[PDB]
Amino acid sequence: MNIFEMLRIDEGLRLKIYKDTEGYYTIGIGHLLTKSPSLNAAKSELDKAIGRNCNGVITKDEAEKLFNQDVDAAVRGILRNAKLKPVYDSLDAVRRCALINMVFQMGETGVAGFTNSLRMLQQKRWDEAAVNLAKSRWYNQTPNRAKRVITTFRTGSWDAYKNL
């Protein structure tokens, strides 16, 4: 398993504009288009993103292209972030994937807000950190996904995704 396979399990693939768990306009593999309530604003962002007139629909090809960009941006954001970088560097390969997953879902900013958990992950206090991560809006709003990510941090293995 790798980051792409992991995210693709968590996000799914939709070739038509759709709404977030959050109600936001999205397409592809969890590519947020706009936080704005207009389908029209979303359509406009979509065409801007792809470089063609899409009329709200893309190909698999285009979806994966956006996906490659989003993953690349997530990793680069982590590396540029003063709070994130140190944690990332301290982690093993599997756990690194779990941090990347969080960043992709919630953005650099959102994750950098989990001060106490970050501290515990750096210290390699896996069980403690898993309990602290669960105490969040994130876990209450998307519990099955959060619990997959959390197990990943707890165990350092891909078991949560084996099932799936």
3-state secondary structure string, the chain? CCHHHHHHHHHCCEEEEEECCCCCEEEECCEEEECCCCHHHHHHHHHHHHCCCCCCECCHHHHHHHHHHHHHHHHHHHHHCCCHHHHHHHCCHHHHHHHHHHHHHHHHHHHHCCHHHHHHHHCCCHHHHHHHHCCCHHHHHCHHHHHHHHHHHHHCCCCHHHHC
Annotated binding site for substrate: 32, 104, 117, 132
Match 């709404």 to its residue by tokens.
19
CATH number of domain containing 35 = 1.10.530.40
For residues 121 and 14, what is the distance between their CA atoms, to the nearest angstrom? 33
Match 């038509």 to its residue by tokens.
16
Residues marked as catalytic: 11, 20
**Determination technique used:** X-ray
Residue numbers of the domain that contains 51: 1-164
User: What resolution in Å is listed for this PDB structure?
Assistant: 1.7
Number of domains in the chain: 1
**How many residues would you count in the chain?**
164
